[PDB]
Amino acid sequence: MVTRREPAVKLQYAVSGLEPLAWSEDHRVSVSTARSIAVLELICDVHNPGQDLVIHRTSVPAPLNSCLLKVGSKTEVAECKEKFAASKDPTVSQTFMLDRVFNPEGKALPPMRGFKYTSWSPMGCDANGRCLLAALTMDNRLTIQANLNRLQWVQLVDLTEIYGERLYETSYRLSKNEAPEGNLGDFAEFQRRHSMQTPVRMEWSGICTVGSVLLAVLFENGNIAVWQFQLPFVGKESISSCNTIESGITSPSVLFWWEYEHNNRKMSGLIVGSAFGPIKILPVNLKAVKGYFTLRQPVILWKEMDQLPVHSIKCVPLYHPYQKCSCSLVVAARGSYVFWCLLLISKAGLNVHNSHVTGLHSLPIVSMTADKQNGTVYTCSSDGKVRQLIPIFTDVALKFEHQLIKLSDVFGSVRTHGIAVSPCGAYLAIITTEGMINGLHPVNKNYQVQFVTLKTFEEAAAQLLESSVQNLFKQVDLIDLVRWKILKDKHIPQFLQEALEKKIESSGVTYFWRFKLFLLRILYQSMQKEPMEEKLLEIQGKIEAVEMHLTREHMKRVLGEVYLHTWITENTSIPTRGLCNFLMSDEEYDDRTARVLIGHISKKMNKQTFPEHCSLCKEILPFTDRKQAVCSNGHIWLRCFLTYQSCQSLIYRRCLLHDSIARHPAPEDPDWIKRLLQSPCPFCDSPVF
Amino acid sequence: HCRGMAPNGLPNHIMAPVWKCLHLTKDFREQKHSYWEFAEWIPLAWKWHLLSELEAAPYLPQEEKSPLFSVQREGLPEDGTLYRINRFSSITAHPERWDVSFFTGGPLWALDWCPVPEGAGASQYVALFSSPDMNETHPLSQLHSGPGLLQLWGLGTLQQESCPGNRAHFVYGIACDNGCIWDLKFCPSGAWELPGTPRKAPLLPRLGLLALACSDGKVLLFSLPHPEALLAQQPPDAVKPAIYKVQCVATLQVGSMQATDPSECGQCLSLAWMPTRPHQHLAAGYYNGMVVFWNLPTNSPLQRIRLSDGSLKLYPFQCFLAHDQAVRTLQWCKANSHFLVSAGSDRKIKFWDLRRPYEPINSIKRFLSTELAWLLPYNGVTVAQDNCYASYGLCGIHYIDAGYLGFKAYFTAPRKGTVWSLSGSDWLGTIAAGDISGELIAAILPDMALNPINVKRPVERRFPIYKADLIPYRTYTETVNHHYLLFQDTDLGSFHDLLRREPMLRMQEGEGHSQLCLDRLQLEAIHKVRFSPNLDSYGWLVSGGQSGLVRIHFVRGLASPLGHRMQLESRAHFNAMFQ
DNA sequence: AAGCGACTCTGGTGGGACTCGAACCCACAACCTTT
Numbered sequence A: 001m002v003t004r005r006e007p008a009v010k011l012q013y014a015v016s017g018l019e020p021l022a023w024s025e026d027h028r029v030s031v032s033t034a035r036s037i038a039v040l041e042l043i044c045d046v047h048n049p050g051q052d053l054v055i056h057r058t059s060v061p062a063p064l065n066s067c068l069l070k071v072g073s074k075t076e077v078a079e080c081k082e083k084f085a086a087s088k089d090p091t092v093s094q095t096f097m098l099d100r101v102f103n104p105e106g107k108a109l110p111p112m113r114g115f116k117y118t119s120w121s122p123m124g125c126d127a128n129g130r131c132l133l134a135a136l137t138m139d140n141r142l143t144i145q146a147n148l149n150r151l152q153w154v155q156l157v158d159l160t161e162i163y164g165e166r167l168y169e170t171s172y173r174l175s176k177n178e179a180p181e182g183n184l185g186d187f188a189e190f191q192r193r194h195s196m197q198t199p200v201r202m203e204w205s206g207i208c209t210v211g212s213v214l215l216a217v218l219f220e221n222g223n224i225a226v227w228q229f230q231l232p233f234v235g236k237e238s239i240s241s242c243n244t245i246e247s248g249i250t251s252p253s254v255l256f257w258w259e260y261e262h263n264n265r266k267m268s269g270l271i272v273g274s275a276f277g278p279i280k281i282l283p284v285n286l287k288a289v290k291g292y293f294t295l296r297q298p299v300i301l302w303k304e305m306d307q308l309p310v311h312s313i314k315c316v317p318l319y320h321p322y323q324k325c326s327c328s329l330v331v332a333a334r335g336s337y338v339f340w341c342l343l344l345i346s347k348a349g350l351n352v353h354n355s356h357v358t359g360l361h362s363l364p365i366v367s368m369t370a371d372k373q374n375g376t377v378y379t380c381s382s383d384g385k386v387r388q389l390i391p392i393f394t395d396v397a398l399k400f401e402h403q404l405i406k407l408s409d410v411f412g413s414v415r416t417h418g419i420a421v422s423p424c425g426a427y428l429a430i431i432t433t434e435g436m437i438n439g440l441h442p443v444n445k446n447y448q449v450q451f452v453t454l455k456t457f458e459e460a461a462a463q464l465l466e467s468s469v470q471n472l473f474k475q476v477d478l479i480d481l482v483r484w485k486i487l488k489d490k491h492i493p494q495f496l497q498e499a500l501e502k503k504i505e506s507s508g509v510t511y512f513w514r515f516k517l518f519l520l521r522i523l524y525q526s527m528q529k530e531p532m533e534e535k536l537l538e539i540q541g542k543i544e545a546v547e548m549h550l551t552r553e554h555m556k557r558v559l560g561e562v563y564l565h566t567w568i569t570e571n572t573s574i575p576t577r578g579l580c581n582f583l584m585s586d587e588e589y590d591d592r593t594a595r596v597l598i599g600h601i602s603k604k605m606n607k608q609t610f611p612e613h614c615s616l617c618k619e620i621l622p623f624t625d626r627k628q629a630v631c632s633n634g635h636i637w638l639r640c641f642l643t644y645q646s647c648q649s650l651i652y653r654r655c656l657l658h659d660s661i662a663r664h665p666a667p668e669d670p671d672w673i674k675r676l677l678q679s680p681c682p683f684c685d686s687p688v689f
Numbered sequence B: 001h002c003r004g005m006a007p008n009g010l011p012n013h014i015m016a017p018v019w020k021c022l023h024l025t026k027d028f029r030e031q032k033h034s035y036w037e038f039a040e041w042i043p044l045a046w047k048w049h050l051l052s053e054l055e056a057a058p059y060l061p062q063e064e065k066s067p068l069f070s071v072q073r074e075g076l077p078e079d080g081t082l083y084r085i086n087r088f089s090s091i092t093a094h095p096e097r098w099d100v101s102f103f104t105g106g107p108l109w110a111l112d113w114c115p116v117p118e119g120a121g122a123s124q125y126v127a128l129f130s131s132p133d134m135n136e137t138h139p140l141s142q143l144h145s146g147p148g149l150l151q152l153w154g155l156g157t158l159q160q161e162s163c164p165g166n167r168a169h170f171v172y173g174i175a176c177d178n179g180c181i182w183d184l185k186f187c188p189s190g191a192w193e194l195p196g197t198p199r200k201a202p203l204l205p206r207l208g209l210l211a212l213a214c215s216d217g218k219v220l221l222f223s224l225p226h227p228e229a230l231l232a233q234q235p236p237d238a239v240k241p242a243i244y245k246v247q248c249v250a251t252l253q254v255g256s257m258q259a260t261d262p263s264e265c266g267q268c269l270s271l272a273w274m275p276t277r278p279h280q281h282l283a284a285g286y287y288n289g290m291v292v293f294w295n296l297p298t299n300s301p302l303q304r305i306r307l308s309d310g311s312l313k314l315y316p317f318q319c320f321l322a323h324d325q326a327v328r329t330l331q332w333c334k335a336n337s338h339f340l341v342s343a344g345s346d347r348k349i350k351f352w353d354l355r356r357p358y359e360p361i362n363s364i365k366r367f368l369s370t371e372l373a374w375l376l377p378y379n380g381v382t383v384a385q386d387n388c389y390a391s392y393g394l395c396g397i398h399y400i401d402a403g404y405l406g407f408k409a410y411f412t413a414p415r416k417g418t419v420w421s422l423s424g425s426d427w428l429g430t431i432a433a434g435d436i437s438g439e440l441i442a443a444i445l446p447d448m449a450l451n452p453i454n455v456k457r458p459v460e461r462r463f464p465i466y467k468a469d470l471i472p473y474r475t476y477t478e479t480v481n482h483h484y485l486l487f488q489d490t491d492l493g494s495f496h497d498l499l500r501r502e503p504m505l506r507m508q509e510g511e512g513h514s515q516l517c518l519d520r521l522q523l524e525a526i527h528k529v530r531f532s533p534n535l536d537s538y539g540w541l542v543s544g545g546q547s548g549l550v551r552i553h554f555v556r557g558l559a560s561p562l563g564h565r566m567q568l569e570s571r572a573h574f575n576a577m578f579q
Numbered sequence C: 001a002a003g004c005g006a007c008t009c010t011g012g013t014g015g016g017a018c019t020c021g022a023a024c025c026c027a028c029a030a031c032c033t034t035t
């Protein structure tokens, strides 16, 4: 099942921080690194035959300026630092001088501007369709980053700045009379004012429903700030609130959002893990969305205080087949063990089962990830050992079964610093480093992200055909397995071709036409991008047949919206008469329902033409062709594929795969097409940007 | 500032940090040591099986008599006799200078003082390991697991009335089937109790609690009985080199409760107990570059299991990959136990925040560090080095700020050879260091709150304690049959006229101009140094090396009225509390 | 006078970068080289 994909992504700088590899819902991979976040984007390239993973590389640069936490007035903080450095007591003086939280940049101290942690949002958070990146530097600067154009990541906000202002304006007291205002000349209060705003780790909720999303930021003292962001997020304007709750957990270590669904009742809470062992779920009471609701009472998952640190927590929803209901599996890496707990609401109330699956590794777990679709957990340690860890249902709760993954058989002697499954568990990405050469240390240390398969092409094909999401972008990792096979063997395997025809014959939903279009385009690449020329010309014709189909079905949707909404001159943002003539133009298209739709429209349409003009000419564009429009006197404009207006703008929204184009929405556009412009393109799901 | 000459002949500004360190150490121990810990782990005599003479013989180190040697003492007449002493035997203390040599049967590779609560006035002991064969040398990349012996040597109470005519006594040893021992660390405080403690016959009053780092890659924890309790419990007719086979309190090793897959970690190369009450954690540095911690009181079935013999096995609560290479030395911060420094054979010194192990507080790259010392009062660390990468003559001993104060590294002592071992006396604020050249020196640090670049000249702050010289008279036998060791000892009574006295000129001619010695064993080499951690005997120092001789010295010139008064204060308090 | 703490001041070497010296490689014209 496991073989390597041939790309290895070489990294320029040392990998840095906690759980340093993440693979987003958006199939971008981020490596937190001492001088950047390396961001690797999986493209299912349909325009080239190169069998590799086509990885586009971009990065978030480290900050240029160190993040001094605001603990007092700019003079009083300097007076306090001077006091503690001068303190004749060995304990106070060295406690101050060694804790880099108080000395984020110094004389001989090295800067800590590299990244501690990174956490992708869900998809849909950006101003585009994409997900945002939360990025935490080791000097405690917490930022939210976006890649609005493809080239340059941009900081949308700094949350460490804002929270420091919030605290300063409340004298660092969260409850208005909870204590006297402490003397900042007390090192206990000085340390406290630092501790209460030093972020440990951070995680995004799901989308909440104007959409919203929550970011919980966990501080060294066990405070959690729950930020609420308005969507689409664009900056400080989008921060809808910040509310801080007190966990009371001593030495928090890790954080995750529990989210649950049974009997059509939504519930949610935060699961928090201590550095000393225990794991507990907190009611996030302070919130203002109506759709979500909070845990009734705290529930303790592990109480033991055994001092194994909870290095990681993941949660996956599972349909339990014997209890015949929705349940939630929590797994946590604690030392060299995976704590697991299965939470299952029943008529008996919340039923809780927990255990440790044991004997996994002879060293602490360095990273963990779960296949969200099945709960298969992968765990890793500096041995270069990865272990697949399968949940098997039991009449109540689970048992875990596990087996080692023989990474040494594919990479040789290696250290593994992190792992991440792709969103569909098609690939395991893995940070690797040169290992012990028969007990010799490696003379030189270079980091690489490397990739191994976890599923065969035939399992990927089966999962793509019986797809739940029916969405090529969400499944673009499984798609890359199908791409790799077809490029390698230069034909579509018979069972897939027959099964896809059966799905098209029976269901026929535009997902299966988009899937057929993908196979044909990769096939056309595979045969060198004479009978071979006839074969190329043949399948180029077949691509056009399905590509025209996906167009005509989308044209019918556009006309559908135009018909259902108010027929008013705001229609000028759509070339309605052009589409009417085009869509009925040929008896090559059978659909009587489209022709009657055009009948109703053409009966209601005005006789006034309102033609589209080429701006450089103010001469009409006849709507001759799908891809593009041309005027007399020689100009060419790309047409949009969402609306069909021509892109005469100096800026327009090109698909991630460049298969397709769309306009930016204008304020002149009505809401019902400002909606439509946010669609994925008809030829592939992808962000059109 | 302060001015004039101290009564020992050093300038007052050179002595002023030394006197300051006495009070700082006493206050620290009052706050953060304790008088009792680990009450569960009292020695049980039925776990101390005495091996017979024919059972013990495989464990005994193999040299039966020392090399021939002679000791010259500055300002005394030349004795001229060659001494030689049997394995497990000692020369008598010099009647005026109280130095003692004793022979352990093999080259010494671990050594520590038994800690005693200040004011107890107890009998003082050292634990040490001397390798079986002079010619053995062990590859780091491979586990060993051979047979060896841990030795406990009693030094007496070391009071001025007791020192003339003193001798070291081999009180007992433990047969160890776990290979050679690379580090020894006693529990810093709370392990000792009075030898007269009433305990029923199975239970023996505890002398101490001791961690062994094995080349077998595991740490062994022994609670030690007072010798008188064993000898009264032992039959009187037994052979006097009492070699016991002892079940541990616990075996400490890297693993998980069902992972049989053997650890990458390899040999265990360094130890550090947590410096502060209740000392509940023990750290170890490993060949694979990990630092490992065990939570010794742990009840958890994920960390504690009881073996069929009733001893515990402990699996670690935390590990992290500190270095790209063997972690050759650890020091744990006394002033705040969240911080630890470790140095590796990738020759980086890394300072750690144990709350945040993913990134060191500071890495400073240096020469190939052999040992660290982290004295209580100073933010930085003192580094002994292997010379293989330093520029010629720029190797030596360096003090290195942890980095907030931002001072440049202070070159406290130039050395030609690699300094194998170093220790800082918290009571004195001084370091002593031992060289492949077989020279032992001490150096007094300036008050490292103040920028060392204004130190006019470091040489006035250091002096030699002894140098061993081979005199003709490569295998060990090929050396000893042809050479004897000339130990040259300084007059430590005072530092008057220091730089004009012969041993300083000999040392300064050693610095720079002298040359490395190869194509012989280096029988001259010193391998360990330890200043006394105890307030009683705080001025005493022990060292040893490839000769298998071990030498005890008293730096009379730094023992001074403030410490003598502080001893007597603590003596009176202890006698008032425990009776 | 006698001394402290900056501030240069006189010399020695290492880190990474880079010149160094060599053989190896092209393709052609010269002609030795063969029945």
Ligand SMILES: [Zn+2]
Residues within 6 Å of the ligand: A614, A615, A616, A617, A631, A632, A633, A634, A635, A636
């Ligand atoms: Zn035109």
Ligand SMILES: [Zn+2]
Residues within 6 Å of the ligand: A655, A656, A657, A658, A659, A660, A681, A682, A683, A684, A685, A686
């Ligand atoms: Zn597209």
